[PDB]
Design an enzyme around this catalytic site. Structure first.
Site, PDB file in Angstrom:
ATOM      1  N   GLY A 193       3.382 -11.034 -10.480  1.00  0.00           N
ATOM      2  CA  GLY A 193       4.747 -11.492 -10.585  1.00  0.00           C
ATOM      3  C   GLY A 193       4.940 -12.986 -10.547  1.00  0.00           C
ATOM      4  O   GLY A 193       6.083 -13.442 -10.575  1.00  0.00           O
TER       5      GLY A 193
ATOM      6  N   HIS B 114       6.042 -11.964 -22.629  1.00  0.00           N
ATOM      7  CA  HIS B 114       5.519 -10.637 -22.308  1.00  0.00           C
ATOM      8  C   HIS B 114       6.382  -9.898 -21.288  1.00  0.00           C
ATOM      9  O   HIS B 114       6.003  -8.812 -20.850  1.00  0.00           O
ATOM     10  CB  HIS B 114       4.057 -10.729 -21.853  1.00  0.00           C
ATOM     11  CG  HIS B 114       3.830 -11.678 -20.717  1.00  0.00           C
ATOM     12  ND1 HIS B 114       3.015 -12.787 -20.829  1.00  0.00           N
ATOM     13  CD2 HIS B 114       4.263 -11.661 -19.434  1.00  0.00           C
ATOM     14  CE1 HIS B 114       2.983 -13.429 -19.674  1.00  0.00           C
ATOM     15  NE2 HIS B 114       3.730 -12.767 -18.809  1.00  0.00           N
TER      16      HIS B 114
ATOM     17  N   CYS C 197       4.033 -15.218 -12.877  1.00  0.00           N
ATOM     18  CA  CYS C 197       4.331 -15.760 -14.203  1.00  0.00           C
ATOM     19  C   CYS C 197       5.808 -16.126 -14.316  1.00  0.00           C
ATOM     20  O   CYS C 197       6.666 -15.575 -13.608  1.00  0.00           O
ATOM     21  CB  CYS C 197       3.945 -14.766 -15.298  1.00  0.00           C
ATOM     22  SG  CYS C 197       4.849 -13.217 -15.249  1.00  0.00           S
TER      23      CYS C 197
HETATM   24  C1  LIG Z   1       3.655 -11.975 -15.790  1.00  0.00           C
HETATM   25  C2  LIG Z   1       2.954 -11.156 -14.724  1.00  0.00           C
HETATM   26  C3  LIG Z   1       2.151 -12.104 -13.866  1.00  0.00           C
HETATM   27  O1  LIG Z   1       2.566 -12.292 -12.736  1.00  0.00           O
HETATM   28  N1  LIG Z   1       1.048 -12.711 -14.350  1.00  0.00           N
HETATM   29  C4  LIG Z   1       0.310 -13.759 -13.663  1.00  0.00           C
HETATM   30  C5  LIG Z   1      -0.829 -13.079 -12.899  1.00  0.00           C
HETATM   31  C6  LIG Z   1      -1.647 -14.102 -12.138  1.00  0.00           C
HETATM   32  N2  LIG Z   1      -2.273 -13.687 -11.026  1.00  0.00           N
HETATM   33  O2  LIG Z   1      -1.723 -15.264 -12.517  1.00  0.00           O
HETATM   34  N3  LIG Z   1       0.562 -12.370 -15.542  1.00  0.00           N
HETATM   35  C7  LIG Z   1      -0.138 -11.253 -15.735  1.00  0.00           C
HETATM   36  O3  LIG Z   1      -0.388 -10.450 -14.850  1.00  0.00           O
HETATM   37  C8  LIG Z   1      -0.592 -10.995 -17.146  1.00  0.00           C
HETATM   38  C9  LIG Z   1       0.436 -10.082 -17.812  1.00  0.00           C
HETATM   39  C10 LIG Z   1       0.277 -10.041 -19.328  1.00  0.00           C
HETATM   40  C11 LIG Z   1       1.446  -9.279 -19.941  1.00  0.00           C
HETATM   41  C12 LIG Z   1       0.207 -11.452 -19.894  1.00  0.00           C
HETATM   42  N4  LIG Z   1      -1.893 -10.353 -17.130  1.00  0.00           N
HETATM   43  C13 LIG Z   1      -2.959 -11.012 -16.666  1.00  0.00           C
HETATM   44  O4  LIG Z   1      -2.930 -12.178 -16.368  1.00  0.00           O
HETATM   45  C14 LIG Z   1      -4.257 -10.291 -16.506  1.00  0.00           C
HETATM   46  N5  LIG Z   1      -5.265 -11.154 -17.060  1.00  0.00           N
HETATM   47  C15 LIG Z   1      -5.802 -10.867 -18.232  1.00  0.00           C
HETATM   48  O5  LIG Z   1      -5.632  -9.795 -18.806  1.00  0.00           O
HETATM   49  O6  LIG Z   1      -6.631 -11.883 -18.846  1.00  0.00           O
HETATM   50  C16 LIG Z   1      -7.277 -11.546 -20.072  1.00  0.00           C
HETATM   51  C17 LIG Z   1      -8.466 -10.638 -19.824  1.00  0.00           C
HETATM   52  C18 LIG Z   1      -8.369  -9.261 -20.046  1.00  0.00           C
HETATM   53  C19 LIG Z   1      -9.471  -8.440 -19.841  1.00  0.00           C
HETATM   54  C20 LIG Z   1     -10.670  -8.993 -19.400  1.00  0.00           C
HETATM   55  C21 LIG Z   1     -10.762 -10.366 -19.179  1.00  0.00           C
HETATM   56  C22 LIG Z   1      -9.666 -11.189 -19.384  1.00  0.00           C
HETATM   57  C23 LIG Z   1      -4.616 -10.064 -15.034  1.00  0.00           C
HETATM   58  C24 LIG Z   1      -5.793  -9.081 -14.928  1.00  0.00           C
HETATM   59  C25 LIG Z   1      -3.422  -9.596 -14.199  1.00  0.00           C
END
Ligand SMILES: *CCC(=O)N(CCC(N)=O)NC(=O)[C@H](CC(C)C)NC(=O)[C@@H](NC(=O)OCc1ccccc1)C(C)C
Ligand SMILES: *CCC(=O)N(CCC(N)=O)NC(=O)[C@H](CC(C)C)NC(=O)[C@@H](NC(=O)OCc1ccccc1)C(C)C
Lengths: 301, 301
Positions: free
Chosen positions: B138, B41, B140
């Site tokens: 950040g 992603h 990930c």
């Molecule tokens: C890669 C960016 C990063 O640092 N991530 C780790 C964040 C963390 N605190 O562990 N990853 C993300 O921010 C990812 C990015 C996507 C492109 C994969 N997003 C999330 O983890 C979000 N979580 C999420 O959307 O979980 C599914 C969900 C959606 C809606 C309602 C319930 C669950 C989070 C909100 C940043």
């Protein structure tokens, strides 16, 4: 989010670790520039260490840096540490400082055996100048440190285990933390306390992470809180402590004295089955800096 | 003595961490030989990642290894990871393997931001295939690993945070642990359990360290224990589990089924104010191997 007992990356310290062997004693040595620092009880055979050290040569000391012999060209006692001058500087020496910490402050421990890193974990310096570490035989010489950008603030080197299973050592100038000495006497840790400002820092970590059930409408003065603190063997809370919590206060919107009121009811009523950040105890080994770092995003290089 | 949530030394992994930037997304990359592995992603702009990746060039990808530009000469999707072929091999690549772990097993996490190590901490893979990590924006791309002598068994790379504050990622072939996907849907962790064999391993760590107050005269059959386990949302205990505890059993002299009886009364009666290894909870994130390693003296290099 999440909250975890997190250490600094150990790689900068891993590169300074060495095995010191003289006589039938083998321990860990810290190699910075051209000196290896290590506990003086590596010295051969109640001891008069000045006496026993005049009786040693340079070649008495076998320094292994991984697979490489390190030729010792001088030695010297500094309080309870030994300083072994070697003919080669450690090309991996990070930028560093020797800084003594206060009780209440935390550091990361790289436990080592025979000069080889074994594990890394986070500790605090207890009010009674011990540390609740995790150490076996041969671990002495292993160091405690903090990182600050690229600089390794060495604060602890490990020496001995006390009868309660707690640990005692020295800063990197060989000055012991606490009334402990590097011989065999009936030494015992003194009565310990809880680090109040650290527990408050951790309650703010709980609130930053969505744990709010302990929050409450009450307030209290500093003096009244402190009356409940000592009653529960908690450290006194000073005005500076309150200023150091200011950022956490202002970020969560909970006044410091308001968070104190919550700590009061927690101490007086217990936790009624619940948990805070996955703990059923009031944790005191996170400083306000530890919380801010873990719940803001700070790195080191 | 002492018992601590201890991680592996991170230095071998610190040397593989890099910053991947393409578009306005910046995350962490794992650099082994001439490949940088990272979450897919990072790809620009519900997504059809195959579609979006054909739309990218090599120069779209900015790889920073500390202060050094890393020229990408190829790319490719592997499940949910990206593999970025760069023109320079990582001279710090340790010996490594990509191994998928089972729930119940533990690993060390090197949380990273912008390719810079931030902290290191120990985790387990929860029965519901999440991990209770500590991660901010950040983070990930940060990896989970174990060390075994000199070999780094990479098992996890971090991807996302679930609504309960728990974390989800993939092994290093891009296959997610659990029914989680790398998009934005209403994903939620499933109901979790307690890792029984891990709690038993930790009770043996308590006994090895002198905590014995929970020990008892009682015994129980496997089937009867398991009747109390499920009642308290604990994993079933298998005969293999009992064999894996054999060494701890034999070292402390407490039969596995005898230790089960103690876990029974602990579950049925609670802990009556006391603590076990400084915990007021039954800890389940230490495996029998973790205990044996920490209470025997094993190292890695
Ligand atoms: C890669 C960016 C990063 O640092 N991530 C780790 C964040 C963390 N605190 O562990 N990853 C993300 O921010 C990812 C990015 C996507 C492109 C994969 N997003 C999330 O983890 C979000 N979580 C999420 O959307 O979980 C599914 C969900 C959606 C809606 C309602 C319930 C669950 C989070 C909100 C940043
Ligand atoms: C340097 C060897 C080493 O690995 N040590 C760390 C051990 C540990 N588990 O933390 N250090 C020691 O083993 C030292 C060696 C001396 C030469 C300093 N010895 C101890 O720590 C003993 N502790 C001890 O003697 O404490 C004082 C005491 C003595 C008698 C009764 C009560 C208290 C320990 C028993 C190994």
């Amino acid at each position: 989010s999440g909250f975890r007992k997190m250490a600094f990356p150990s790689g900068k310290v891993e590169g300074c670790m060495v095995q010191v062997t003289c006589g039938t004693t083998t321990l860990n040595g810290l190699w910075l520039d051209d000196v290896v620092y290590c506990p003086r009880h590596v010295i051969c055979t109640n001891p008069n260490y000045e006496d026993l050290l005049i009786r040693k040569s340079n070649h008495n000391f076998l320094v292994q840096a991984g697979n490489v012999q390190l030729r010792v060209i001088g030695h010297s006692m500094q309080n309870c540490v030994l300083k072994l001058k070697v003919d080669t500087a450690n090309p991996k020496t990070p930028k560093y400082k020797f800084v003594r910490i206060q009780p209440g402050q935390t550091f990361s421990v790289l436990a080592c055996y025979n000069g080889s890193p074994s594990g890394v974990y986070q500790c605090a310096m207890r009010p009674n100048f011990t540390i609740k570490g995790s150490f076996l035989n041969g671990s002495c010489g292993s160091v405690g440190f903090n990182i600050d950008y690229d600089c390794v603030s060495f604060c602890y080197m490990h020496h001995m285990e006390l009868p309660t299973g707690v640990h005692a050592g020295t800063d990197l100038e060989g000055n012991f933390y606490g009334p402990f000495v590097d011989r065999q006497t009936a030494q015992a840790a003194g009565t310990d306390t809880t680090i109040t400002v650290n527990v408050l820092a951790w309650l703010y970590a709980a609130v930053i992470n969505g744990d709010r059930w302990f929050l409450n409408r009450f307030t209290t003065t500093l003096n009244d809180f402190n009356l409940v603190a000592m009653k529960y063997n908690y450290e006194p809370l000073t005005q500076d402590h309150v200023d150091i919590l200011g950022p956490l206060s202002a970020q969560t919107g909970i006044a410091v004295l308001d968070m104190c009121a919550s700590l009061k009811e927690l101490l007086q009523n217990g936790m009624n089955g619940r948990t805070i950040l996955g703990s059923a105890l009031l944790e005191d080994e996170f400083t306000p800096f530890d919380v801010v770092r873990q719940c803001s995003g700070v790195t080191f290089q």
